[PDB]
Structure formats: structure tokens, C-alpha cells
Amino acid sequence: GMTETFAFQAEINQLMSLIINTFYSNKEIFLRELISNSSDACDKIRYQSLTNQSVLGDEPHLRIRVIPDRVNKTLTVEDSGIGMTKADLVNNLGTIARSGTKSFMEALEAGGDMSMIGQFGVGFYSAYLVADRVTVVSKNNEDDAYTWESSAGGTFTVTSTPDCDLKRGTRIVLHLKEDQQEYLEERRLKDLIKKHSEFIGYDIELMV
Ligand SMILES: CCNC(=O)c1cc2c(-c3cc(OCCN(CC)CC)c(Cl)cc3Cl)nc(N)nc2s1
């Protein structure tokens, strides 16, 4: 549809630039962060479903999917959680993330570690540890499907993008850095998902 371009404020620019360039050597934490976020998104819709049930609609199964694509060199994390509207995408990835981002960087300046990113509610940006481009396709019950995309150049785009395969929830598509192809391997991902699956209340499906 119509593509709108938005700018990141300075803190998010600084964070993205920090993360995309860092020599932090435990980059695998990105997966933990995205799965955690997917798990929380499933909680929001489940909560709604207790009071209504009709909120689930055509997508009753609350689950998380990890999908490597060796052909296009992408790794996807998708869920059937509550999803985000156009305003939610912007609000979540731009607006509400600012004070968390600021505090995160201050914690790093004071001896903190990159693995703490989730404490600040900005764990999503850990995606840039292994990706040079991240695409977020989302569908909330109260809006059309929208696609947010950024390559960390100071701007992001939000585009209406009809997608029948996403009835509700969020698909995060990581276009991996050239030196980060291990996260397309079946074994690597299996071992990583097993690490935290027992503590995630929803099915995590690895699609080979
Ligand atoms: C009803 C509205 N739906 C949502 O809010 C959803 C969000 C997300 C996110 C998600 C969450 C993020 O930050 C979470 C913490 N924030 C709250 C203080 C601080 C900004 C970010 Cl930065 C990016 C993404 Cl993609 N991820 C996923 N898989 N699903 C949803 S559904």
C-alpha cells in the first residue's frame, strides 16, 4: 500500500548503531529476546480471550514459530499473539522505547552488559546483533496488517501490506549478517530453543 517513512529519535539511533557495530561475542541472546517478546504477546491475547473468546477468531492456537530460510539467508520468529496496529508499531519501536533505550545505554556506560537489554524493555533491538535488516509484519484485531522495516540508517518505514497467512500476531524477519549464518542451522537453533522452552508457556515450533 502506501509507504510512510519515519525517523528514529537520537537515543534509538545511538542504540541501533551501538548494537549493529558491537564486538559483543555472545550474539545468540537475540533469540531469547525475540521469543520472550512473542511469549508476552501471546499472554496479551490470551488475557483478552478469557473475557471474550471471540478475540481469538480464526486463530485459536497461541504458539511461537522459528523459521530458518537458507535460500534467502533469513531467520524468522513469528507468533500468533495480540499483534500491533500501525500506531502500535511506531509507539513500540519508536516512542515508548526511548526511556528504556536511554537507561540501557547508561547501564552499559556504568559497567552493565548487553545481555541485560531485556531488563530495559528494548530487547527487540538485539536483533541487530545478527541482522543488517529487520522486518516486522504485524496484525492486530483492530487494524489492517502493517509492515515495519529498518536497516538502522536513522529511519524506518511503515507500510500497509495485506497478508492472509498472518491472521493475528507478529512475524519478525531477520536478514542475517554475512558472518552470522550459524543461526540458519537446524542444530544451533534446536539447542537454543531447548534452553528456554520449558520456561515459555507456549509451543515453540522449529520449522526445518
Ligand atoms: C497490543 C499492542 N501490541 C504490542 O505492544 C506488541 C508488541 C510486540 C512485540 C514487540 C515488543 C517491543 O517492546 C516490548 C516492550 N515495550 C512495552 C513497554 C516497550 C516498547 C518491541 Cl520494542 C518490539 C516488538 Cl516487535 N513483539 C512481538 N512479537 N509481539 C508484540 S505485540
Residue numbers in the entry: 1 to 208
List sentences from the manuscript.
Among the chaperones, heat shock protein 90 (Hsp90) – alternately referred to as Hsp83 or Hsp86 because of the variable molecular weight amongst different orthologues – is a hallmark of the stress response at the cellular level, and a major component of the eukaryotic proteome. Its main function is to serve as a molecular chaperone helping nascent polypeptides avoid mis-folding and limiting protein aggregation during thermal stress. Although the compounds represent diverse chemical scaffolds with unique properties, they all inhibit the enzymatic ATPase function of the chaperone by binding the ATP pocket in the N-terminal domain (NTD), which together with the middle and C-terminal domains define the highly conserved Hsp90 protein architecture.
The thienopyrimidine derivative compound 3 is a very potent human Hsp90 inhibitor identified by means of a fragment-based approach to generate novel chemical scaffolds. Based on our assays, this is also a potent inhibitor of TbHsp83. The molecule is composed of a central di-halogenated phenyl ring, linked to a thienopyrimidine moiety at its position 1 and an alkyl group at position 5. The thienopyrimidine moiety occupies pocket 1, in a similar arrangement as the purine moiety of compound 1. But unlike compound 1 and the benzamide derivative compound 4, it shares several contacts with ATP, like Asn91 a hydrogen-bonding partner of the ribose moiety. The halogenated aromatic ring is positioned against the protein at the entrance of pocket 2, with only a chlorine atom occupying it. A major structural characteristic of this complex is the modification of helices 3 and 4, each shortened by a couple of residues.
